[PDB]
Amino acid sequence: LLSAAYVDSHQWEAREKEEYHLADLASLMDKAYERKLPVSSLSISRFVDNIASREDLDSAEYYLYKFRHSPNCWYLRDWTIHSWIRQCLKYGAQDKALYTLVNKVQYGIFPDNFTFNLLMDYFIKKGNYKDALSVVFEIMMQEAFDVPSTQFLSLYVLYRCLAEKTELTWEEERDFGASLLLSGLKQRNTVGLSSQLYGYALLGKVELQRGVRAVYHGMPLMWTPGYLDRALQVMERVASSPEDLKLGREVLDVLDGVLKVVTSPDGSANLVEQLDTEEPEQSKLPRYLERFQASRSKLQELNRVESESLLTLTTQLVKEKLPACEAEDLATYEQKLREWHLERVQLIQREQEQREKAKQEYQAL
Amino acid sequence: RKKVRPRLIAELARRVRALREQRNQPRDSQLYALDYETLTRPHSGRRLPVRAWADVRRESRLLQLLARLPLFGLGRLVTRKSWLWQHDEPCYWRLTRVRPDYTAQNLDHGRAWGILTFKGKSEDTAREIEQVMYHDWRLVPKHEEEAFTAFTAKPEDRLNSVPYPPLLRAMILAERQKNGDTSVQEPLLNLERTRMRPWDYPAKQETKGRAKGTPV
Amino acid sequence: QPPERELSRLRRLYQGNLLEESGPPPESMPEMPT
Amino acid sequence: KAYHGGHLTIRLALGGCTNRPFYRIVAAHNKCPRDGRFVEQLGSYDPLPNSHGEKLVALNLDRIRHWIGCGAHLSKPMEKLLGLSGFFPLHPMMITNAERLRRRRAREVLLASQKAESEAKETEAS
Numbered sequence: 001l002l003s004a005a006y007v008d009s010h011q012w013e014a015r016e017k018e019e020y021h022l023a024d025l026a027s028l029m030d031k032a033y034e035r036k037l038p039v040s041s042l043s044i045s046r047f048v049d050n051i052a053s054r055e056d057l058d059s060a061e062y063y064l065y066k067f068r069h070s071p072n073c074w075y076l077r078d079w080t081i082h083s084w085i086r087q088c089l090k091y092g093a094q095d096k097a098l099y100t101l102v103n104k105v106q107y108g109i110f111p112d113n114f115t116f117n118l119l120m121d122y123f124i125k126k127g128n129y130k131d132a133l134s135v136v137f138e139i140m141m142q143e144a145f146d147v148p149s150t151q152f153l154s155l156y157v158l159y160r161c162l163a164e165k166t167e168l169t170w171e172e173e174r175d176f177g178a179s180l181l182l183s184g185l186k187q188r189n190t191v192g193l194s195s196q197l198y199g200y201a202l203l204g205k206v207e208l209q210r211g212v213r214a215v216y217h218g219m220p221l222m223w224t225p226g227y228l229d230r231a232l233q234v235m236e237r238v239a240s241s242p243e244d245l246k247l248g249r250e251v252l253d254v255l256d257g258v259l260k261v262v263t264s265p266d267g268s269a270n271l272v273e274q275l276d277t278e279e280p281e282q283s284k285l286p287r288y289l290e291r292f293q294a295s296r297s298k299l300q301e302l303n304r305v306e307s308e309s310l311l312t313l314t315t316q317l318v319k320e321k322l323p324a325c326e327a328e329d330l331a332t333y334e335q336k337l338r339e340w341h342l343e344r345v346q347l348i349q350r351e352q353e354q355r356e357k358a359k360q361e362y363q364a365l
Numbered sequence: 366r367k368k369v370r371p372r373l374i375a376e377l378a379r380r381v382r383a384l385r386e387q388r389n390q391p392r393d394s395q396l397y398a399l400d401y402e403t404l405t406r407p408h409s410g411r412r413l414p415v416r417a418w419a420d421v422r423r424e425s426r427l428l429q430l431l432a433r434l435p436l437f438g439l440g441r442l443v444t445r446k447s448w449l450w451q452h453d454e455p456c457y458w459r460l461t462r463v464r465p466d467y468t469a470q471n472l473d474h475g476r477a478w479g480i481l482t483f484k485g486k487s488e489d490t491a492r493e494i495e496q497v498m499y500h501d502w503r504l505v506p507k508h509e510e511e512a513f514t515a516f517t518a519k520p521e522d523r524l525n526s527v528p529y530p531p532l533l534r535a536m537i538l539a540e541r542q543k544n545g546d547t548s549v550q551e552p553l554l555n556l557e558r559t560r561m562r563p564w565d566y567p568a569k570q571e572t573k574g575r576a577k578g579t580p581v
Numbered sequence: 582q583p584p585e586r587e588l589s590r591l592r593r594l595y596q597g598n599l600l601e602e603s604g605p606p607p608e609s610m611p612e613m614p615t
Numbered sequence: 616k617a618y619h620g621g622h623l624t625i626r627l628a629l630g631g632c633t634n635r636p637f638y639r640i641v642a643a644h645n646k647c648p649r650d651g652r653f654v655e656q657l658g659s660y661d662p663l664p665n666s667h668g669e670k671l672v673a674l675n676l677d678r679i680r681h682w683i684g685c686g687a688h689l690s691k692p693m694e695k696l697l698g699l700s701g702f703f704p705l706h707p708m709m710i711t712n713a714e715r716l717r718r719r720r721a722r723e724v725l726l727a728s729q730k731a732e733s734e735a736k737e738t739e740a741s
């Protein structure tokens with residue numbers, strides 16, 4: 001979806017970079033770990049910058065692992081993380097980039113929203129919508145849908161994959177539901193409000209079939225039961241809103257299907273997590289089904305339902321709004337490059353001063 | 366006297382022993398490791414109490430949540446399942462600093478710092494967090510923070526003064542008459558100066574003890 | 582008498598190890614049976 | 616002994632002979648033996664009814680107030696004595712135990728009435 005300018009690497013490739021042989025730098029880091037001594041963030045930065053081959057990436061992956069399991073893991077720099085993804089794309093190692101991103105806990109690769117779009121867009125153009133979905137799920141796990149550009153790309157991948165996937169497993173429903181909900185909340189357009197109702201519906205299905213702990217456990221989601229209540233509220237809000245807002249017809253069918261399925265179904269971690277006084281969600285389904293029909297009637301009466309499919313609505317939204325976002329993000333990208341350049345120079349200067357002092361210390365000693 | 370003589374071996378022993386302790390200090394990844402099949406700590410062979418078994422299998426530790434987040438979740442809010450069950454009002458930590466245990470192969474053990482908000486009332490300074498190795502922590506989602514942290518304080522209704530005990534009240538009134546003070550005022554105790562925190566209130570981790578490094 | 586919500590909070594905390602709930606005690610000491 | 620750590624406490628030290636208990640209320644370091652070194656004697660407790668049927672407690676309330684003001688803890692039996700005297704409020708378990716006794720005698724009275732009703736059925740059978 002993104003333009004060639006967005007994914008162009010002329011600016012990154014023109015960065016001022018120090019020339020250090022990887023073999024020499026490898027030895028320095030190896031000695032520090034043998035002596036249980038901290039390694040500098042500038043040291044790991046120089047290694048990633050001077051990667052020159054596909055084989056070198058494999059060695060850097062090992063050293064990024066070592067840095068994560070070292071005293072100075074927190075100091076891994078943003079530009080080092082961005083250069084890693086840029087190097088992986090350059091030499092054809094996209095699988096390695098996705099591998100480290102999925103295994104963030106081990107390697108410490110937490111890219112920014114711009115880097116996420118670069119990796120996610122590569123897969124989209126190649127037609128690998130299974131790997132692109134993995135990037136979307138990783139963005140959701142980190143709750144990093146802040147930049148508008150990432151929200152549009154994530155919704156395009158999700159809806160395109162959902163259309164192909166007629167059958168959804170409970171884990172898939174949970175992952176898709178969370179990704180839709182978090183991305184949808186940011187957007188106030190028709191596509192955004194449809195994704196919120198779509199996301200709450202899927203999560204509500206998993207809540208009433210497998211329990212509320214399946215939804216929130218290990219997920220960036222709340223633990224309070226009543227996800228189908230959140231879905232119905234979206235319908236009630238649009239119907240009563242003074243402004244004219246519309247919910248796609250496709251989502252309304254999904255919620256109707258979920259309500260019907262749940263309504264008429266066919267070691268020591270066994271706890272009742274809800275108070276006895278509070279009504280269980282299953283007992284509330286009869287009332288929930290009445291609200292849905294009433295809301296649907298009011299929406300159709302007010303002509304607030306969009307017959308167009310969600311995949312077609314999202315495609316139009318991406319075409320109209322994504323071009324503007326690319327210009328804004330690219331301007332911020334240039335500013336970040338200059339900020340990173342200055343911060344890197346400061347670290348190099350500070351290193352030189354301490355080394356000079358180290359000579360003076362030995363002279364005194 | 367002068368027949369009391371030096372004990373060089375005793376002095377040598379004390380210093381030598383203390384040095385080894387500093388050299389061979391254990392790490393959080395070892396002291397707080399657990400065997401989930403038996404719910405027993407391998408280091409000391411200490412089997413966890415019975416009331417904790419369900420949560421040990423059903424809940425996560427703090428740095429298990431934070432290891433998956435950028436910057437180890439600095440600025441994020443974290444609550445405890447025990448607090449969620451006991452108190453209706455929001456109880457959480459606002460993370461400020463986080464020191465993972467690099468030795469751990471998953472960075473799942475360490476220490477953290479933050480600002481406490483217990484039962485809706487927030488402290489003014491950051492301090493170290495206790496019970497970080499417990500299976501009780503729940504990370505709050507960013508989109509749910511505003512609804513989670515919303516609190517409206519109710520007017521305090523717990524009595525501020527109470528009567529004196531029956532005998533101690535009679536001794537006070539008797540002293541009044543003896544000294545010439547004539548009054549019918551009822552002696553009253555003031556409870557504002559001495560109000561007790563809840564029993565589950567977070568304690569000072571900085572002054573807490575740490576287990577020794579001798580395995581059982 | 583405890584509030585009803587608080588009695589439910591304790592039934593969840595000690596679920597599986599509970600005793601029959603007791604009501605208000607007799608107003609006076611029952612006369613010893615003889 | 617040369618103790619390291621501990622706090623001052625007000626407790627009952629057991630005296631007397633076999634089947635004839637007698638207590639001395641004392642302020643003592645908590646780590647000392649029950650009947651060993653103490654700091655001050657603060658009274659006495661005789662738990663056996665005397666000729667008049669009175670259990671006799673003596674409390675030096677001026678010295679007791681002095682040692683509570685200096686950090687002295689209280690043993691649970693001594694907290695019960697101060698509650699009965701009126702110098703302290705009644706201990707929570709003194710009230711809870713009295714409530715348990717009331718609920719336990721109510722059952723006994725009800726059972727006797729049920730037995731009497733069952734005995735009445737026997738009388739009806741003749």
Ligand SMILES: [Mg+2]
Nearest residue numbers: 496564565568
């Ligand atoms: Mg405790």
